């Protein structure tokens, strides 16, 4: 038998349903989602980190001339100068007044320290959802990890359950993501091979151990000071460190709907948005005939306490009279009130106390109890606390 | 080195089995066939037998098998097997045989002793799979090369293993014999036996090479004597009773696992093409049944697939977008029309 | 798949029960009223009340490495190409991504190949690979296999060591005086699909897109156009007076 149901997208709350049959007893269903993940499909483009200015020892020739040989190191700058009078701690490295030539060559390489201290770029698309559910059908408790696409149901005890696609494909992530130190920021990083000096992306390395990088740091060599040996060089500071000083706040504290982002695998938790359609195919074995369930007679309901707070704050006692003693499920067809428990123990002439949540000042509604309808009416009062530490439990009707 | 490969099957013995059809009828045989596998392309098939090969009572080509508990050996070139035509035995190793012979419907395996012929036939399908798209019955002398799957010729430790089990109790009516008034039990030298009887009350006795007689029993048919062995495991055969307790003491590798190799595949004759305005005709003459696959190079292919085993005529239309076809195993041929 | 039969469990002249090993799609049954036989005559003495127990199961065959079928889901095809570009007699062969970014840089020249004008992909959402051939087939999803058709056995990987089987294995009454386990199940669906074997994508693809699978890919077929954007610096533009007129 096919049964369609709707699930609000919010973990931490229970949800009760009754499956009605004309000739058989109603069947209870209790569902509690424990954790929902919105995992994006992300690919890896490149990695960047601190760079280190490499240089070879200066090439000094005395009364002669030199030539530049290309090593093809990334962003290599090679230059030759003349008119130098070298010095050393022991004395004069030359006897020539002029014609001495110096060759200075410089380049960059990835800093050794950034095996872990590396910033990663990312491009994300086509987020998929994965929910962990606790199901109780026919008082059979099970915990399941289910896929919520248009296929891939789960089978247990013959019950088949399929959760349809999301009602909304919204994703907190933008196209272009940046990952660093377990923090995820939406940033518009430039693409491969088009970096600029001073900004994020002066260095471009495909992988951590690619050993093939493209660098654009605007490195410029300078005339060495007379009377000493060195290679003066100048380049813009690290765009990585400049972006580190900028550091706009995190998606962890700026994303809407209160999503919780985690970075072991990139994922978003408990994004409270939308609803999940679910379809039950229940075998006829679990369905119970009417004669096997107690039937009430002359039952009345009275409200003992009223607080229409966020939590369950309406307590009602039902005085009934039953031929048989057996557990059965109570249900509220309307959205006026939400019952807490899924079933209540039933004895031969006892009274059943039930807890529920409502937002109406003057509640009045009918309880389906296992064979019959019973009216229950009353007026109710506000709470005493202006703020609470848990979300809403019942819908707000017009 | 191969003795380290042979070492696994030094720990086991052959076993008698039931076979539904000896030369006489329903029968107990040493050459009962458990299973047959035929997945290789060139007709290479694997038989799982109840005997052992390559081990003497280490020798190259021999068959080691069982006779009422007594192990015997025969040269390998005496046994034969067939389905529709005489097959050819290549090599044997342990409980497995590799055979190469054409299609059929049943597998018969037989051999001849000095005066008694042993055989039986099992009806398990054997299938011959052609490679490519040229159906044949015997691989050609010449052609081209392709990659199909054939069964490897040599044994090596692969990732496929089987399970042995502790042998059960084997009843032997030969051991029991009638004395003047009692029943005489004579277990074989160096082996233990279990005698269980109900001639009087319940009886159970483990004899260890002891010729013991039991009172209160007059006839011999009332009760049974068994044989006990601890070493020399047996395969998990469905034709034997099991021992007592957990039935597991390791596993053995299975040789002759399939592999990839180079395959000879026939070549069809060249079809003679004749061209006309936006059309082509293929004068065609096949040696064996062969596949035509034809496609158009447009948004929709109108793909046509056809098996022809006789000379025929086909007229095809070609447009500027293009026509493509494969006959046999030739590289695909693409034709592109022109204005004229 | 390979049917694995346990050794027939005999307790003649007594009684037995079932011990589930929890192997995939295992079936355990108990039969009474058996008079088994062995080469050395009858096994035991009691005429009736003899209990056989037969346990049968299925395990992946030993030939699963070089003879197996894989099911894949395909979406968001990506295009790239190998170009040989000669501008200002500067000829280079280079790989380029024809997406809307990632220019190729040489001699100061930056070439951007924009996205494809058509999103046509020669693969359906589901595909099946087997022995270097690809077929667009609607295979049933994992866990919903049907006997006698594709997907009777479902293993997460070649060595997952855990499979879900739906082969409809049913035991039968053993023949009198014979130690054996008579079983019945539908033929494997993989060989039936092999018998069917509709023509492959490399012979039925539109636009003639040649399909090779070192990785699953398609090549050499004409659909649409590549927009090209040239970013040329001002240095390579030569004076006319320096050129023949």
């Amino acid at each position, epitope marked *: 038998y096919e049964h369609a149901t709707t699930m609000p997208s919010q973990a931490g709350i229970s949800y009760n349903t009754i499956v009605n049959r004309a000739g058989y007893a109603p069947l209870p269903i209790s569902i509690t989602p424990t954790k929902i993940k919105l995992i994006p499909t992300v690919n890896l483009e490149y990695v960047t980190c601190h760079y280190k200015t490499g240089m070879d020892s200066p090439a000094i020739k005395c009364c002669g001339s030199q030539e530049c040989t290309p090593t093809y190191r990334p962003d290599e700058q090679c230059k030759v100068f003349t008119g130098v009078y070298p010095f050393m701690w022991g004395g004069a490295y030359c006897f020539c007044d002029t014609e001495n030539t110096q060759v200075s060559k410089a380049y960059v390489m990835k800093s050794d320290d950034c095996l872990a201290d590396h910033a990663e770029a990312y491009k994300a698309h086509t987020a998929s959802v994965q929910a962990f559910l606790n199901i109780t059908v026919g008082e059979h408790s099970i915990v399941t990890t289910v896929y919520v696409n248009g296929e891939t149901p789960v089978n247990f005890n013959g019950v088949k359950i399929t959760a349809g696609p999301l009602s909304t494909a919204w994703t907190p992530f933008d196209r272009k993501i940046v990952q660093y130190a377990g923090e995820i920021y939406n940033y518009d990083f430039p693409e491969y091979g088009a970096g600029q000096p001073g900004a994020f992306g002066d260095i471009q390395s495909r992988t951590v151990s690619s050993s093939d990088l493209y660098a654009n740091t605007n490195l410029v060599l300078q005339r060495p000071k007379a009377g000493a040996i060195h290679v003066p060089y100048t380049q813009a500071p690290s765009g990585f460190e400049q972006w580190k000083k900028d550091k706009a706040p995190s998606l962890k504290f700026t994303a809407p709907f209160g999503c919780e982002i985690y970075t072991n695998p990139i994922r978003a938790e408990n994004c409270a948005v939308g609803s999940i359609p679910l379809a039950f195919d229940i075998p006829d074995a679990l369905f119970t005939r009417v004669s096997e369930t107690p039937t009430l007679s002359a039952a009345e309901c009275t409200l003992n306490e009223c607080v229409y707070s966020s939590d369950f704050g309406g307590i009602a006692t039902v005085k009934y009279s039953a031929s048989k003693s057996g557990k059965c499920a109570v249900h509220v067809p309307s959205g006026t009130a939400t019952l807490k428990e899924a079933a209540v123990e039933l004895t031969e002439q006892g009274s059943a106390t039930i807890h529920f949540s409502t937002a109406n000042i003057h509640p009045e509604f009918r309880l389906q109890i296992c064979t019959s309808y019973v009216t229950c009416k009353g007026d109710c009062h506000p709470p005493k606390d202006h703020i609470v530490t848990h979300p809403q439990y019942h819908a707000q009707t017009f | 080195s191969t003795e380290e490969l042979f070492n696994e099957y030094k720990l086991t013995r052959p076993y008698m089995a039931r076979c539904i059809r000896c030369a006489v009828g329903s029968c107990h045989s040493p050459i009962a066939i458990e299973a047959v596998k035929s997945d290789g392309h060139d007709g290479y098939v694997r038989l799982q037998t109840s005997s052992q090969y390559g081990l003497d009572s280490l020798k190259g080509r021999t068959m080691r098998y069982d006779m009422h508990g007594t192990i015997k050996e025969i040269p390998l070139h005496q046994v034969s097997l067939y389905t529709s035509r005489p097959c050819h035995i290549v090599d044997g190793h342990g409980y497995f045989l590799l055979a190469r012979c054409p299609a059929g419907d049943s597998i018969t395996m037989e051999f001849k002793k000095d005066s008694v012929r042993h055989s039986c036939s099992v009806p398990y399908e054997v299938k011959f799979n052609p490679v490519g798209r040229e159906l044949y019955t015997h691989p050609p002398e010449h052609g081209v090369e392709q990659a199909c799957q054939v069964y490897a010729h040599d044994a090596q430790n692969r990732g*496929a293993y089987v399970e042995m089990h502790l042998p059960g109790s084997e009843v032997d009516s030969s051991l029991v014999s009638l004395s003047g008034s009692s029943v005489t039990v004579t277990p074989p030298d160096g082996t233990s036996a279990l005698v269980e009887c109900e001639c009087g009350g319940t009886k159970i006795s483990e004899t260890i090479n002891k010729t013991k007689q039991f009172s209160q029993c007059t006839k011999k048919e009332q009760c049974r004597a068994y044989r006990l062995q601890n070493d020399k495991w047996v395969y998990n055969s469905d034709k034997l009773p099991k021992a007592a307790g957990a039935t597991l003491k390791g596993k053995l590798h299975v040789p002759f696992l399939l592999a*990839d190799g180079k395959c000879t595949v026939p070549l069809a004759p060249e079809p003679m093409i004749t061209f006309g305005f936006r059309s082509v005709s293929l004068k065609l003459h096949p040696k064996n049944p062969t596949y035509l696959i034809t496609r158009q190079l447009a948004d929709e292919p109108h793909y046509t697939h056809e098996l022809i085993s006789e000379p025929a005529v086909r007229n095809f239309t070609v447009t500027e977008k293009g026509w493509e076809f494969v006959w046999g195993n030739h590289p695909p041929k693409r034709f592109w029309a022109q204005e004229t | 798949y390979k049917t694995g039969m346990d050794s027939p469990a005999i307790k003649c002249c007594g009684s037995q029960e079932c011990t589930p090993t929890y192997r995939p799609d295992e079936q355990c049954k108990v039969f009474t009223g058996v008079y088994p036989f062995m080469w050395g005559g009858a096994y035991c003495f009691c005429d009736t009340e003899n209990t056989q127990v037969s346990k049968a199961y299925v395990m992946k065959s030993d030939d*699963c490495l070089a003879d197996h079928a894989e099911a894949y889901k395909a979406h968001t095809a990506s295009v790239q190409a190998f170009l040989n570009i000669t501008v200002g007699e500067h000829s280079i062969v280079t790989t380029v991504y024809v997406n809307g970014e990632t220019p190729v840089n040489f001699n100061g020249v930056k070439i951007t190949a924009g996205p494809l004008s058509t999103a046509w992909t020669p693969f359906d959402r589901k595909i099946v690979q087997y022995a270097g051939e690809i077929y667009n087939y609607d295979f049933p999803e994992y866990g919903a296999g049907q006997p006698g058709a594709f997907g009777d056995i479902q293993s997460r990987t070649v060595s997952s060591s855990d499979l879900y089987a739906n082969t409809n294995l049913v035991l039968q009454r053993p023949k009198a005086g014979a130690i054996h386990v008579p079983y019945t199940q539908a033929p494997s669906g993989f060989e039936q699909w092999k018998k069917d074997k509709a023509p492959s994508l490399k012979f039925t693809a539109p636009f003639g897109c040649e399909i090779y699978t*070192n*990785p699953i890919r398609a090549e050499n077929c004409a659909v649409g156009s590549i927009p090209l954007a040239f970013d040329i610096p001002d240095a390579l533009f030569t004076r006319v007076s320096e050129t023949p007129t």
Partner: nanobody
Amino acid sequence: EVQLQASGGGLVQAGGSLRLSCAASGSIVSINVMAWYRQSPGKERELVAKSSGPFTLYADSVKGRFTISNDAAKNTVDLQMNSLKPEDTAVYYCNAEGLRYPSGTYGPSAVWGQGTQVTVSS
């Protein structure tokens, strides 16, 4: 993006014993097909070894002289070479097929490493 890095090989005399190691790194959890391929100068690519879980395969000309071992925990494949012949001069590549990304953005199916050159001197 998963990549394969090859190591080992080098120069050796006839009859020597070497090792080749290929390692996979990236967003991968479980791997199915480990394979090795050799390409001599002037000839097309060919398979030499093929490992997948417990099973191992070998070609016709290479039986009894090469051994392949796979470590799924490290996602590495090691090829032990013994008693090499002058026909073995070629460049060896390591292949990975049937990659299972741990969601794990679905991506390219197969990947290829740079490979290593092996040369034996007569």
